[PDB]
């Protein structure tokens, strides 16, 4: 009866004024921190887009989302999709973000189940995954932290999205005696 379900959806408000941001890259750790950036300030929601760009091996990606009731009155209607992040990510096919699995999407990808003694999930605020040494095809996937239904003092929150764009990296098959095969990972 209980089962894993798939879902669709990109936005709930007008767009094309996305306000892109790059991720904060601390030398191998790429971070999208939404703690102060989604608090309700302007009347009406403002979509904010963090952009992670990966063209090198073993990049850790950390995404921080504030919790429901983490601070009083500011996150009473926060939502995060997908719920099983980072095991489930959002991918765009028909301009709708449909739920797909990250281990099918990049082959050989490993997800630690505990980020820092707490569960690797948005229930604990922060998700975190490390990309493998070789990715063979370019891949884009998405996460959403929607505070745009929270309203305090007649001001609505923000819809933050994370776009992880992985370029192909890892080099050619030959002249890589370590990742080639016949004895290897």
């Amino acid at each position: 009866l209980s089962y894993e379900t798939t879902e669709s959806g990109d936005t709930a408000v007008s767009e094309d004024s996305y306000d892109k941001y790059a991720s904060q890259n601390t030398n191998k750790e790429y971070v999208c921190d939404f703690t102060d950036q989604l608090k309700p300030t302007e009347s009406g929601p403002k979509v904010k887009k963090c952009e992670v760009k990966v063209n090198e091996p073993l990049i850790k990606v950390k995404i921080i989302c504030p919790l429901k009731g983490s601070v009083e009155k500011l996150y009473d209607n926060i939502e995060y999709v997908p719920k099983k992040s980072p095991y489930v990510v959002l991918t765009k096919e028909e301009t709708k973000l449909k739920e797909k699995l990250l281990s099918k999407l990049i082959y050989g990808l490993l997800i630690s189940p505990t980020v820092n003694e707490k569960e690797n999930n948005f229930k604990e605020g922060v998700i975190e995954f490390t990309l493998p040494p070789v990715v063979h095809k370019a891949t884009v996937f998405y996460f959403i932290c929607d505070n745009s239904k929270t309203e305090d003092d007649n001001k609505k929150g923000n819809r933050g999205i994370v776009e992880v764009y992985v370029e192909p990296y890892g080099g050619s098959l030959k002249e890589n005696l370590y990742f080639q095969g016949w004895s290897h990972p």
Partner: antibody
Amino acid sequence: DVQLVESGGGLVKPGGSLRLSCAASGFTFNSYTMNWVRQAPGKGLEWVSSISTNIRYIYYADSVKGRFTISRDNAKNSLFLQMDSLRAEDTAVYYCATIAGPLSLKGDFFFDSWGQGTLVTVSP
Amino acid sequence: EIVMTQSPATLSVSPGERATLSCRASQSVSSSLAWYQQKPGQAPRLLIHGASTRATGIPTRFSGSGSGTEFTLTISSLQSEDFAVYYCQQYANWPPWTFGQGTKVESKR
């Protein structure tokens, strides 16, 4: 000996255009986010525009976007602001300013060094 | 856009005494605040970043404190150089980076 020399200010009638430049010296120019901040006579500081070390994330003030255009030349150590279709509100002294590091979603976006500004007067 | 209200409007204080300035924010900025000094006719000088981390080349009499909504810049023993206008700036919820409207400290004689 960090130096930021602004140039290009002056008097323009409303609707006209102007191009401010900022020649910098004394630091590695390609690893700094460049910014323009204006100050009306007697009034406070107002940020107008910014460009990251990666020339993809450019940000404008809400009142000036669609009129202003920021640009960067890393080889000449120069920063540019084209101001077109100027209204009367834009009369101010314009300061060239630096932020250490690239422009991210969060963290440490304060103005490390400033220039001496140039006056832009919009009046008919 | 969250507004930064500075208090007081003008502050008259004798040299050698202590001056505390208050920056108040509409929404929490959570330690993403900077203080700048502007002597008249000059460019602003960065004083304190991070709301308690003194910038390099800044006198020790300047000190920053505060969280979320309320911040204070304190000059403990005031000198002649420090008579200027002082601005607070948040960099947490952006665009835009918004400034306060300034606090003029004047030499009481």
